[model samples]
Target: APSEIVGGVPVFKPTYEQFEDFYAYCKAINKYGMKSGVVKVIPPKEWKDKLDLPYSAETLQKIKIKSPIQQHISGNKGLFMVQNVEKNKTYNIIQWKDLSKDYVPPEDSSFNIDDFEQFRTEYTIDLSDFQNTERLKFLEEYYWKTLNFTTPMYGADTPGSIFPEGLNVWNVAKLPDSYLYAGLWKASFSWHLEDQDLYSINYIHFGAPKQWYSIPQEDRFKFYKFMQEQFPEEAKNCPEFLRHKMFLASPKLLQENGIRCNEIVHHEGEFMITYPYGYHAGFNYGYNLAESVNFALE
Candidate 1:
């Protein structure tokens, strides 16, 4: 979404220095990766006040941090920020931790095999309208015959279809309508989510622009550097968490597959500062006094 210009200036873009803090934290963890369990992150008052939101407080209190053993049964920890992205632009910044580790079915799992198979069939075959019709008719038949269910199943839902009113399906195919659609879609999508795949259904329906997911790592790094230079004083105070290592994935793949996998861990042992748009803008160190270890991975 285009940032809201509070004073008539574009919001500051993210800087690599901010990503540095994220890397630093990760490096500290990798260096001492043996620690087990979760760690809650708290932002300084300056950030909280500037953003005019209770992200720090909510993150510390409301967000759950699961142990490795309990991860599948629970949600993971999350941290976020909200601040003025541009000198004149105001926005709300919000980001969260991706899903935790995978779930392992119990040895004596009460889950029924037949039910599980049914679920798989319903989840995959039944969800594809094209396949449900003719492509996988045999598989669909086998499922009903083998399971002793007489009714022919229908498609469950589109892969990431949102229900009731799916935001992904609005069509503004005409010229003026398309422009309006583009603007509204960008603003709405940007406000709620980042990392494209999390909002795949929306992207597919609205047809995201080509450049949306094509940002190169080198170009992103350049933008990060630009942010650091732009916010000299603020850059000095960027957080250590931003300096920790982080893995980034391809936005296109993430959107299409609904898979969250990181290919590169950039900038270990650094801190990052965030813009009002919730983008990491700068990086620094010596802010967080907590122990620098990633017990969560252990």
Candidate 2:
């Protein structure tokens, strides 16, 4: 145990003030860290016993402290923005439904998910003119500066594979990551890294607990190799291996290899920090909500 490093991903459980200083600590400890999406993180705990409920669209309709983020639908590229972003990039702020007063995160009683494939249809909240129409910012009370991270559409923070001309999306380093992650039961995000392992912090607001696992950068390849050996179909599907693919591997397969997985059940107000190149995967226990964002580990 290297004290701060647990399983493989490091953790930060500090107050808001402590969160501020870690920027300098990172500079000294492992500087020049997050070059691209190569960083993933879950920080310390400054929140607790707050919005104690599972965050569904209905739950988030009320309040929270942290929750599970929505899942990503493969081969789908649709983005909608709410607030303002930098670099003239297509950045939006919010949890979609908040854009319109009458808007509520929709729920289709009829939809399907393949036990081994992505959802048939994904519902995303509309973000256009969201800020302009709202009488009062609903999420202001729960907003935390550290929620949003990573460069969007090749965001400002990440500089990895999508390198050179595909430069930073948001001109600033630490982009706003404050948004409600309202999802219903079985809402799952497939296996993947944070853009390139961009260091990030996730917090639960309310709802079902989020279960997550981490494969350290060093042993990430081991995971891939394991997937190739057993889940060959999954490996083949994961072309880039770490980016752009959903892999469902049993924990035993991963643990058998050298990969150290930080399998955890995160609660409301608690923080989880992931490092660069740390391949993380997990999903909501039920319809849960959470706020997360990527930050410069460098």
Which lDDT tens digits does candidate 1 get at residues 244-266? 32212223323344322111111
TM of each candidate vs. truth: 0.19, 0.48
Cα RMSD to the true fold for all candidates? 24.1, 15.9
Best by TM-score: 2
| Tens-digit lDDT string for candidate 2 (1-298) | 1124333334434344444454554554343222111222343333222222222233222332232222223221111111212333221212221222221222222222231122112223232322322311222111111113211111122111101122122212234333345543333444566665476666554444555666656676776666567545545755675454444443444565665565655554455555677666654433334566767653
- In angstroms, the error of model 2 at 17 is 4.3
* Candidate number of the best lDDT: 2
